Amino acid sequence: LRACGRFFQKHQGTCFYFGELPLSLAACTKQWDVVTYLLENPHQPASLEATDSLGNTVLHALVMIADNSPENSALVIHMYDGLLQMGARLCPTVQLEEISNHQGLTPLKLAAKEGKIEIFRHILQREFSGPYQPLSRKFTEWCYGPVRVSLYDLSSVDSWEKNSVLEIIAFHCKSPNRHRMVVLEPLNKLLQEKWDRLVSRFFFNFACYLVYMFIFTVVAYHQPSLFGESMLLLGHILILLGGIYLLLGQLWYFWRRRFMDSYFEILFLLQALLTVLSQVLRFMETEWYLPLLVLSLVLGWLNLLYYTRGFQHTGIYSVMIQKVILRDLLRFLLVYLVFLFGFAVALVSLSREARPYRSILDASLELFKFTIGMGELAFQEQLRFRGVVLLLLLAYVLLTYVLLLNMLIALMSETVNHVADNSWSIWKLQKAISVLEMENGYWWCRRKKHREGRLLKVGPDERWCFRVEEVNWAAWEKTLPTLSEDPSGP
Amino acid sequence: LLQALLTVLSQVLRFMETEWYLPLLVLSLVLGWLNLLYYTRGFQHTGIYSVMIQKVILRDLLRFLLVYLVFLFGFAVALVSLSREARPYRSILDASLELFKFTIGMGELAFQEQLRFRGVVLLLLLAYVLLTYVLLLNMLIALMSETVNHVADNSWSIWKLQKAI
Amino acid sequence: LRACGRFFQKHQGTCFYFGELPLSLAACTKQWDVVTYLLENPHQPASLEATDSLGNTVLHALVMIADNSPENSALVIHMYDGLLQMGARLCPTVQ
């Protein structure tokens, strides 16, 4: 009896989304005796694979009620494991983990999309011994003393499939916990493996872009006044070809992905648009292409800072300036402006009388030169109101040199609690985005996606696996079984 | 080794009557006065200061300067590419020097009139000023966050290791 | 019987360098009863001063497996002290 009302649906406000199904309610409400009675009974058996109006089964409902609190996460983990074990003994023919809702996702995918990290980490590294062996994802291969190779499962986790946990985390997710689902194993080992296979193409792209930017700098610097001529026209044609190529690439990227990590692609689009506009304005014989070409050159040299992600830990510096350039700067500048204009107008309104600051623009420039430590504080004599002008100049100096101090103190207090783990996780997330972007290939030719791990039977189900080696000097029990009796390293 | 090699080369160039020994002798003198900071290890705890600048001079400086360079050259070229027209910054070297003087707090932000593109030149100068004064702030914040967890025990141990050597 | 293979040598990758010697393996694997049985027995006595291909004895192997973790360091310290004490009572003439 589906309770497809308004209070039971998932929305902001007074709600409690348990999946509008009595078995789902008993599962979510910590009523394991009631769950056991509802799952098996001679009168009315409740199917565990039943779906509500949205298409969610009980596992999706258990995923969607999970918070990040430790008290609720233990409930979600224990009830998920218990329901999986009871589904093993009731309907073993059907695989109830792979049941998809109307959006098309699975409970692992749903935990990835909504940002429920506490059930995601458990479902990615769950291990069950005894009779419930095949429904595990943390298989144990050979162990030789303190070193053991653990085989994780890459079913619906590798990027070879049409929809993956990696793609959902990188692009489709929307949560503050996007970066924290990349550090956890086996996603740390998986994305480190694909990056080492793609760093060659990343550096090749860096070299090609550096050659293009060197050609652009040579063309811009040796621009004639508004063999050498043929070389310059060949360079202009090459710049036009590179600009239209990069514009087509960015257009294909924005068509495929139909925000902070998306900044540099917007800068790439702006740079390509500006150089294409500069070339088409030069072709139209307009004397305004030179500011646009120079602006494109400046924007491109700024854009070149994107390729610092792959130079090892350099990115952990660079990500901070990204946060810095969205911390308060675009506000604080406005605060500086709402001084400047006012004071500038004041100076003009007090400098048009006689017994310097002629217009608003010159007054603004002479007021701005107190920040770079260059402006003058001379005692005027030609102006009639010398003392009031000096008093306003001193007041502006004091207000600027206290506003900058306040800004620096505020930024220090903001960054003093910033540990290195968060910045490292942000850099790892950016590398994950770059890996999943390059693996799709260029727009003019699509790369052949290759599997990772190997296909080996576990207990005769053929399950893809990824091997992670570990050393543990405290696991001296030798009780868990091993699939293979031979080490057989790579 | 570099100081000894430079002063030996300066002496052998003076013996060969070459008028290029004077830059090498002066460079050797500068390098030697820099080298004199090695002997601060034995002046008690003074070394616990000095070791930090060693880490500082290998922390990010030789990278960060390059980052500063990959602005400067670009912007400098831009200024040259926009200052050769008429209705200042003559060559690449003078443009680089006039752009560098915004870091020591000496460069000028005047409104040009002889150039045809006054507004675009001013906009690029303002953009360079903002980018420099945010990059230096970011560098200082990053260095502070790097050194805030640096206890005195690690620096004391480093100084003791240098004294052991 | 020296296990002078490739998996048992010390190198980056899949390795477990215990010294390629059964007494060394029992010492490194926290098997003090097996170590006591191998050190003294009427059938086949294992010399504590035996060396592998690299020339390491059991003490060098106990040194090379030590990490900086507190759980492993206690194992290395206790097994080193126990092997030194058992070497005192078996071959006191040699150092």
UniProtKB/Swiss-Prot annotation, chain A:
Segments on the Cytoplasmic side according to the record's topology features: 253-258, 309-329, 410-490
Example GO biological process: response to temperature stimulus
Membrane topology: Multi-pass membrane protein
Annotated ANK repeat ranges: 18-53, 54-102, 103-129
Keywords attached to this entry: ANK repeat, Calcium, Calcium channel, Calcium transport, Cell membrane, Cytoplasm, Glycoprotein, Ion channel, Ion transport, Membrane, Phosphoprotein, Repeat, Transmembrane, Transmembrane helix, Transport
GO molecular function: calcium channel activity; identical protein binding; monoatomic cation channel activity
Protein role: Calcium-permeable, non-selective cation channel with an outward rectification. Seems to be regulated, at least in part, by growth factors, like IGF1, PDGF and morphogenetic neuropeptide/head activator. May transduce physical stimuli in mast cells. Activated by temperatures higher than 52 degrees Celsius; is not activated by vanilloids and acidic pH.
Protein name: Transient receptor potential cation channel subfamily V member 2
Organism: Rattus norvegicus (Rat)
Gene from which this protein is expressed: Trpv2
Part of the full-length chain shown: 192 to 729 of 761
